[PDB]
Amino acid sequence: TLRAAVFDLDGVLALPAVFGVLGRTEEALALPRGLLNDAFQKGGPEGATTRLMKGEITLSQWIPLMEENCRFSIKEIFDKAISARKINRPMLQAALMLRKKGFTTAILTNTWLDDRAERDGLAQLMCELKMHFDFLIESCQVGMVKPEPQIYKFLLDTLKASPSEVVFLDDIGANLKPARDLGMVTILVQDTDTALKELEKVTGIQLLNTPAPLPTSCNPSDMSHGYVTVKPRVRLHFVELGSGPAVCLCHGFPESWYSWRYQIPALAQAGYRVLAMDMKGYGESSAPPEIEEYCMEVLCKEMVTFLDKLGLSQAVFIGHDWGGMLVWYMALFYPERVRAVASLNTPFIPANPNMSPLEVFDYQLYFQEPGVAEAELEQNLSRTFKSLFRASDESVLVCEAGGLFVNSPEEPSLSRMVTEEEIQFYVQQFKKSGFRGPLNWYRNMERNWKWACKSLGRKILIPALMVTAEKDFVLVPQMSQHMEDWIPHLKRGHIEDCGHWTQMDKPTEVNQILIKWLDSDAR
Amino acid sequence: TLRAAVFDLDGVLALPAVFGVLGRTEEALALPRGLLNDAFQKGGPEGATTRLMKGEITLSQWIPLMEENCRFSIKEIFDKAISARKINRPMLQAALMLRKKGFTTAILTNTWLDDRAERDGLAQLMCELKMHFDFLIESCQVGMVKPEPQIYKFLLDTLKASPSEVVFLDDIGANLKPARDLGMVTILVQDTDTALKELEKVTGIQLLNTPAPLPTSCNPSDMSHGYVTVKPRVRLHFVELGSGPAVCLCHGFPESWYSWRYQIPALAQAGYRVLAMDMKGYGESSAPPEIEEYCMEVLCKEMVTFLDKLGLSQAVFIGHDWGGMLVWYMALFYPERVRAVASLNTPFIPANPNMSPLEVFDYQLYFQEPGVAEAELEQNLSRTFKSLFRASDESVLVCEAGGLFVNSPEEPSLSRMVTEEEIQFYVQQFKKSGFRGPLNWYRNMERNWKWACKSLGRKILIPALMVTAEKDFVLVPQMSQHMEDWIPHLKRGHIEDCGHWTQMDKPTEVNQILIKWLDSDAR
Numbered sequence A, B: 001t002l003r004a005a006v007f008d009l010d011g012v013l014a015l016p017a018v019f020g021v022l023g024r025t026e027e028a029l030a031l032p033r034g035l036l037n038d039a040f041q042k043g044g045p046e047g048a049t050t051r052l053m054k055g056e057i058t059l060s061q062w063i064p065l066m067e068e069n070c071r072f073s074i075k076e077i078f079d080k081a082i083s084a085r086k087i088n089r090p091m092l093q094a095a096l097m098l099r100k101k102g103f104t105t106a107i108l109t110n111t112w113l114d115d116r117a118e119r120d121g122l123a124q125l126m127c128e129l130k131m132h133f134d135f136l137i138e139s140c141q142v143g144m145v146k147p148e149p150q151i152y153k154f155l156l157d158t159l160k161a162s163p164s165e166v167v168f169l170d171d172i173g174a175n176l177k178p179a180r181d182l183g184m185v186t187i188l189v190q191d192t193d194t195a196l197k198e199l200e201k202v203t204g205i206q207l208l209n210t211p212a213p214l215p216t217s218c219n220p221s222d223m224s225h226g227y228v229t230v231k232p233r234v235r236l237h238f239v240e241l242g243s244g245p246a247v248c249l250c251h252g253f254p255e256s257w258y259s260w261r262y263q264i265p266a267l268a269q270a271g272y273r274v275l276a277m278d279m280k281g282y283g284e285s286s287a288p289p290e291i292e293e294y295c296m297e298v299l300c301k302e303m304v305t306f307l308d309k310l311g312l313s314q315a316v317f318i319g320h321d322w323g324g325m326l327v328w329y330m331a332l333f334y335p336e337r338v339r340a341v342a343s344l345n346t347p348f349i350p351a352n353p354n355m356s357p358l359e360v361f362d363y364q365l366y367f368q369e370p371g372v373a374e375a376e377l378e379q380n381l382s383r384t385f386k387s388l389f390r391a392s393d394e395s396v397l398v399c400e401a402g403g404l405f406v407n408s409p410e411e412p413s414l415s416r417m418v419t420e421e422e423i424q425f426y427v428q429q430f431k432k433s434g435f436r437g438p439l440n441w442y443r444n445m446e447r448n449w450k451w452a453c454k455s456l457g458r459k460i461l462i463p464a465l466m467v468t469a470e471k472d473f474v475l476v477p478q479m480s481q482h483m484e485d486w487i488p489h490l491k492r493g494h495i496e497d498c499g500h501w502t503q504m505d506k507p508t509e510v511n512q513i514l515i516k517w518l519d520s521d522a523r
């Protein structure tokens, strides 16, 4: 039985093949057939290309030697061919499905050491692909090349498997040949669909016509964890991924940086430097007990200090729920520090200066009395998160009846939005500080209103996005209707059949909405 | 006696004053004298400008109201005026000198909430200035304005000082008036030199004609600390500051991320995202005991994984000593991941394939035997660092005589390059893992040579800088003479009267050299 799948890069995981550009250049320039392909393979295992593929020489050293075997521009031809080569999405998807089902996956490729001025494009491609596989074996790093028999024995050694346990996929029959002679299952890849039919048939796993997959998530132990002391007793923790303009993600109640797990790899891949916060009172961030430590004024001031200490003059701020509330106040009180602002679910409603704030919000009154909601929420963490984190149809949820979970099961079923593993991550995070810090975010209504009244004559004029979730019953889309009065250039997004837990309910659409808005309005 | 100094921003810490552009526009457009200055102050404490300065309205909301009081472009005039306004360097220098001598320093300014498309320029200015002061009091954040008496009582309250203990500096006599009526020492700032003469006279501290100050350093507790697991038993720690292209700083033996303390704020201010590493075996990074864990191949592989996990397709790599050696091998084996490479002191010398590496390097033989050098180096950490970290003339330093510190004092004097506090930072870092991990970097000579021989046919063709230190007797400038044979486009820098500890010996020149090279060759 098969337990490992091995894929080539050029012509298998990445298309169009760089090999196929030599033939196209010949046809475009009306040169003799196979002229450029011949110059490329000139000298066989003794030639310039074999030296390049073994890592003896770099791509820039090879360009003049290739120009020789040819005797326009080889650099220009290869630059265009490398730029045009993109990830073969259905092939990646099939590799992803096999790994998910327990297969050890690997990429085995004949490649070079790229020192071209434009090497970054390829570096980015390899980075995106590699994260999805157990191993990446590059000819130029191992000083071995396909079809030499040693690279295959090296592949089996790294895989810790016998040939009969390995499916090997390649677009070059000659490179496929030694794997077969060893006893491996082999697929000659010409067109993707037929290759996948062959793969599906031999593995007994459905790979073709499969349902739309969820975006890539985060493994906590694989992330870069950052820590910033904003004041003597206050430290802020964040997860960081990517390069480009800074995008600060702000979760709600009772959440985590992990609530953005589906957005982090997507936003970093779209060209942003993502900073996913543990908001004050949560996870690895500090959780002081005092109520006043959680008023909007102090939270926003600490987020400014967080930027100060990291050396960031600005960040784009994206918030959900209480994070969405924070983000509107960052835009109103610190516009110089906010590149752009986006809120998921939380509308921006100016404070009524002629009315106190306490005058679907029975939840907020139950949360007022210190200790009451903490007692109920901390009693059984697994139950708390399983009851809370549910889609619109999964509804398991007043104050009065004396509690949030009065007519709720002791052992709720697992929502379709989460796995048992993901629930347990939240359980482990909440074991450190409990619910006091998180609940204090609701305990500053009067302070928050007083502070908000100072902004009543202002408008939000920096780039802004409001994202509504059709089926959020706490933060209803209708509550955002008058926002344009205060944010005239406000851009919008809307997600149908989406509950309160936007990021995990509808991750694909959240990502589509944010990336499109970031690229048009945030740089 | 004075213990606090308060500075205005416009016309004091930043020049030319934004107020002085109204008069220049009037003269350029041949408009009636004081026309634009009059429209600006129209309505007094009831006017549009007072509302803007109190934070009732944002700059973008104020532009149309100002256009009104005027009845070209107000936005255009202010955009140019804000862009032109730069930090008043000698004034900042004097504020820096007073704080160093125990003064509580603060900025008190009449400013606005900037929501302009180009607000970043000012956000960057405020960030650079603020880090150097105890307090920043902005009119738009406190809803109070100079010359109203409450802002002055608020300033005294934040300062926790009585008026007679405060020197207050302002370019507007009317704004200076209430501080004087309270009993504060006041300086009307017209020209900088005269203002500083007045400041020097009243404080009794030399501020004018003072020696060239060292670049801004790092306070460890004020930095963002990052942590990346590169493999099960290996975690890498780094300090991170700034935005822009990633610049990875790699220290030598027996050093720390803190060895780059003078480069971190300078490089971040020049527009780079600095990642200052604790190299494997050092500080908060993991220190496994095994020798093989420290061969160049594994170290370079882990640095690639560090980039993978942070989502960085490339970084510019800058190394000193053993970090300089690592950085040349990153360029040779991973060019796709290296934006540009720079080495301080460490030359690039290709391996001799016909000769073993063991055949000024008596230090390296003494370091070979596990436990010997650890015993001597760990015996007294304060003595180890005080003896090592010295300028070219301070020389307190064979193997034979049986030791590194044979004819060295038990209590060495403090080098001019370091403070007692800085030595103690290194002492505290080294208390965690000792010298085993650091010394293992010298214990892979044969493995490193074997790995290096695979690169003998390659050239370094990506952007590269070699920086030589005249008085480094281990890594002598003459050892770098043939480097061009392998790095043809190699750029150079040279530092005279500089010992082995380049960064702390000559910080100003290191920064000048790196920034100039980064801006021309690294983006």
Ligand SMILES: Cc1ccc(Nc2cc(C)c3c(O)cccc3n2)cc1F
Pocket: A253, A254, A321, A322, A325, A346, A361, A363, A364, A388, A474
């Ligand atoms: C159970 C529950 C209730 C409310 C919220 N979210 C919010 C968010 C904001 C922003 C609120 C708010 O601003 C006022 C009152 C209640 C609020 N509830 C989240 C929950 F998990």
Ligand SMILES: Cc1ccc(Nc2cc(C)c3c(O)cccc3n2)cc1F
Pocket: B253, B254, B321, B322, B325, B346, B361, B363, B364, B388, B474
């Ligand atoms: C005491 C001492 C000796 C040498 C070095 N630096 C180096 C750096 C490299 C890079 C070396 C090397 O490559 C071979 C042998 C010795 C080396 N010494 C640093 C010290 F603090």
